[PDB]
Amino acid sequence: HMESADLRALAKHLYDSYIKSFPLTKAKARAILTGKTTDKSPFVIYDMNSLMMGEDKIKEVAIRIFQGCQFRSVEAVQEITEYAKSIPGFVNLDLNDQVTLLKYGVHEIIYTMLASLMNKDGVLISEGQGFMTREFLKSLRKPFGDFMEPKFEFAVKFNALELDDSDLAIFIAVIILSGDRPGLLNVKPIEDIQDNLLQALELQLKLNHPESSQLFAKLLQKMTDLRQIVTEHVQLLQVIKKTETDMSLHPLLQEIYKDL
Amino acid sequence: ESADLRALAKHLYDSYIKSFPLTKAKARAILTGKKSPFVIYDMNSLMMGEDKIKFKHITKEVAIRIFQGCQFRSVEAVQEITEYAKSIPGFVNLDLNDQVTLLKYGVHEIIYTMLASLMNKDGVLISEGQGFMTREFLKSLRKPFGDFMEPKFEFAVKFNALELDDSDLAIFIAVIILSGDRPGLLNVKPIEDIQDNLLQALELQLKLNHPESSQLFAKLLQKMTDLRQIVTEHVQLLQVIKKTETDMSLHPLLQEIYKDL
Ligand SMILES: O=C(O)c1ccc(-c2nn(C(=O)c3c(Cl)cccc3C(F)(F)F)c3ccc(Cl)cc23)c(OCc2ncccn2)c1
Ligand SMILES: O=C(O)c1ccc(-c2nn(C(=O)c3c(Cl)cccc3C(F)(F)F)c3ccc(Cl)cc23)c(OCc2ncccn2)c1
Numbered sequence: 364h365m366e367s368a369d370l371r372a373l374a375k376h377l378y379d380s381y382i383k384s385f386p387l388t389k390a391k392a393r394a395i396l397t398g399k400t401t402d403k404s405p406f407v408i409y410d411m412n413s414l415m416m417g418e419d420k421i422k423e424v425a426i427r428i429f430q431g432c433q434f435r436s437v438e439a440v441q442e443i444t445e446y447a448k449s450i451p452g453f454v455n456l457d458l459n460d461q462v463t464l465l466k467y468g469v470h471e472i473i474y475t476m477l478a479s480l481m482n483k484d485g486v487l488i489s490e491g492q493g494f495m496t497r498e499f500l501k502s503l504r505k506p507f508g509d510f511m512e513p514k515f516e517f518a519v520k521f522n523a524l525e526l527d528d529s530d531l532a533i534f535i536a537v538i539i540l541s542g543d544r545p546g547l548l549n550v551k552p553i554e555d556i557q558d559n560l561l562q563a564l565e566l567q568l569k570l571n572h573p574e575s576s577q578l579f580a581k582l583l584q585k586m587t588d589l590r591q592i593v594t595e596h597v598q599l600l601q602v603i604k605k606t607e608t609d610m611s612l613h614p615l616l617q618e619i620y621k622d623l
Numbered sequence: 624e625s626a627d628l629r630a631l632a633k634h635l636y637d638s639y640i641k642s643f644p645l646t647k648a649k650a651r652a653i654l655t656g657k658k659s660p661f662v663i664y665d666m667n668s669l670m671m672g673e674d675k676i677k678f679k680h681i682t683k684e685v686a687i688r689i690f691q692g693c694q695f696r697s698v699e700a701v702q703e704i705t706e707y708a709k710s711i712p713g714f715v716n717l718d719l720n721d722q723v724t725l726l727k728y729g730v731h732e733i734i735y736t737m738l739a740s741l742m743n744k745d746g747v748l749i750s751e752g753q754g755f756m757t758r759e760f761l762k763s764l765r766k767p768f769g770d771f772m773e774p775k776f777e778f779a780v781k782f783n784a785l786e787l788d789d790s791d792l793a794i795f796i797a798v799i800i801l802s803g804d805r806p807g808l809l810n811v812k813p814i815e816d817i818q819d820n821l822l823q824a825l826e827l828q829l830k831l832n833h834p835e836s837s838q839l840f841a842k843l844l845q846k847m848t849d850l851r852q853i854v855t856e857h858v859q860l861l862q863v864i865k866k867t868e869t870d871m872s873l874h875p876l877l878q879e880i881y882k883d884l
Contacts, residue, residue: 364837543781543849561841580822583844588804590848591855 365562373451373563374533380449381532385442387490388528389479395491396482405487405494421492425507426609428500431488436473437613443469443535450536452556460547466619468539470596471589475535478518486515506603517592521585524578530571533564534582538589545622597623628824631712632794635824638710639793642703644751647740647789653752654743663756678750684870686764689756690771691873694884696749700737701730701884704796711797713817718809725814727883728805731854732847733796735778740792742779767867771860778853782846785839791832794825795843799850 365373382388395403408417411424444465448454453461480487485496500511526534540557542550568578597620603610612620640646653660661672666685673681680692705726708714714722741748746757761772787795801818803811829839865871873881 543845558838561838565841577819577822580826580840580844583841584847586845587848587851590852594852 365559367566370559370563370566373559374529374567377450377532377536377563378529380446381528381535384446384449385476387480387487389526389531390528391491392480392487395487396494403491405492407485407494407496408488409496409499417493421489422609423504425503425505426607428495428503429507429510430610433613433616435488437615439473439476440465440469440615440619443472443539446535447539450539450556450560452552453540456552457548460549460553463544463546464539464541464553466622467544468541469619470593471538471586472535474514474517474589474592475521475531475538477514478521479531481515481518481522483515483519506599506606510599510603513592513595517588520588524582524585525572525575526582527571530564530567533560533567536560537564538586625827628820628827631820631824632790632828635711635793635797636790638707639789639796642707642710643737644703645741645748647787647792650741650748650752653748653755654741660748660753660755663754664760669760672754676750676753678754680749686766686768687868687870689761689764690768690864692749694881697734697884698881700734701726704730704733704800707796708800711800711817711821713813713820714800717813721808721810721814724805724807725800725802729800729802731857732799732850735775735850735853735857736782736796736799737792738775739779739782742776742783744776744780747776767860767864771864774853774856778849781849785843785846786833786836787843788832791825791828794821794828797821798825799847 394400395405398404406417406420408414414424447461447465447468453464456464477486483497485494485498485500487493488495497512497515500515501508503511537557537560540553540560542554542557547553564582565579568575568582572578600620651657661668661676663669663672669681669685669689672678678692680695681688683691708722708726717725738747741752744758746755747761748755758773758776762769762776764772798818798821801814801821803815803818808814825843826840829836829843833839872878
């Protein structure tokens with residue numbers, strides 16, 4: 364049990380690092396999506412021709428879009444790794460466990476943070492300069508169309524929680540410091556860190572969302588929807604791999620899936 | 624208010640005790656050796672136990688008969704969980720289709736959960752604590768059945784490290800039943816309203832019953848992740864067994880009884 368002032372200190376530290384680590388925050392994404400402004404309005408990609416035009420403004424189309432997603436995913440792994448290093452105690456853990464926590468945590472975090480860029484109608488891309496519609500992604504051929512849509516399905520549900528970045532900074536940290544990842548050597552020091560982060564998340568959610576009953580429990584229950592979609596995702600990639608030779612994953616993603 | 628949450632907690636404990644034949648408290652006294660159960664550790668001792676104790680489940684090839692014995696007992700537990708659900712305040716007031724949907728999609732998670740109460744690292748109680756079948760004998764069953772039994776123990780051992788007691792579990796079980804994300808629910812709001820009450824009661828219960836166990840509430844909810852994961856694994860294991868095994872036909876009425884499991 365930490366002292367209340369120490370838990371507030373931890374929350375601010377983590378929000379501050381989250382802001383330094385991730386260039387496109389939820390607050391910026393929501394300002395772009397909600398609009399009103401003339402200076403931050405995205406170009407909208409909703410069909411083939413607008414895609415071609417989008418490349419002038421900002422191999423097969425579905426493959427090109429798929430490769431756009433892994434390029435950003437790789438970048439996200441880099442951003443998530445930098446953030447993890449800022450979590451108090453993380454760089455002090457056994458070095459193999461650091462790799463293990465990142466290996467199994469980044470995908471859950473990418474999905475979580477992907478939701479910040481989504482509404483029910485599409486997703487922000489190219490650092491907010493673009494917006495690709497959900498219907499266009501869903502209409503891609505072969506396996507790729509159905510590969511796009513489950514992310515939207517989770518995001519619509521996660522976004523009903525109305526978390527802001529200061530909440531998400533702690534949530535993300537909790538996910539990374541999971542003592543139940545396969546193959547961890549020293550679970551106790553990981554769980555001790557998570558206990559503090561969980562205490563910090565609990566107090567953060569009560570102060571920032573006082574009228575939102577049991578949001579702490581409901582957010583932890585979302586770590587369940589995350590676990591399942593990551594497993595679905597992996598089994599979709601494998602199917603794509605056994606079909607498509609016109610693609611190859613970045614060595615960073617390359618290694619992460621090796622263990623699944 | 625705290626006294627209302629304690630009331631709800633005691634209400635659920637009382638009902639939990641009437642609904643389930645073997646409580647975790649009684650099961651642990653048997654497992655720790657604190658009237659010895661009959662021990663099934665190999666083929667010959669299995670033969671004697673059914674001739675001496677006459678287990679109604681295990682009664683074809685031996686690995687198949689044990690597997691079907693687990694399916695028989697699961698069918699019994701479904702009825703026990705269903706009766707318990709009726710005691711959860713607000714449950715019988717839900718739309719009847721939603722009551723059936725919540726039970727349909729929750730019984731598997733609850734059965735794994737309560738199975739842990741009857742398990743330790745060395746085996747599992749059966750027949751209301753009268754028998755004990757070793758983990759090694761179950762794990763050593765041939766073909767797919769051996770690998771079907773062992774994941775249950777692996778989950779149980781990790782879940783049991785939480786050291787929940789029956790008063791804790793009665794509320795936990797109720798939380799699982801009142802999941803508003805089950806497919807096909809017609810009216811989600813009253814289910815989530817009830818789950819919110821039960822979570823408050825579970826949170827308070829764990830702080831009072833386990834004051835030294837930091838963040839036990841969060842860790843128990845995180846186990847809903849392991850529960851969802853193993854139940855879906857469970858499903859893919861049954862499908863393989865069904866599509867593979869031709870020595871599995873029971874009387875068609877028996878097949879009807881077991882459908883869904
Ligand atoms: O900015 C960000 O933070 C971001 C994070 C993720 C994606 C994104 N990955 N993705 C995957 O499939 C994927 C995930 Cl989740 C994790 C690991 C590996 C992969 C992959 F290797 F398999 F690629 C998506 C599938 C559908 C959608 Cl709509 C988005 C993603 C992202 O794309 C934005 C985007 N939409 C369309 C066109 C271009 N760009 C941005
Ligand atoms: O008393 C009780 O409360 C009880 C609750 C569960 C089992 C049990 N189910 N089971 C399953 O597979 C299963 C689960 Cl988890 C959930 C839903 C459906 C099923 C099923 F339909 F597929 F059966 C097991 C697998 C392995 C083991 Cl060791 C036990 C179980 C139980 O068996 C006791 C037992 N051990 C050995 C031999 C005979 N009998 C007792």
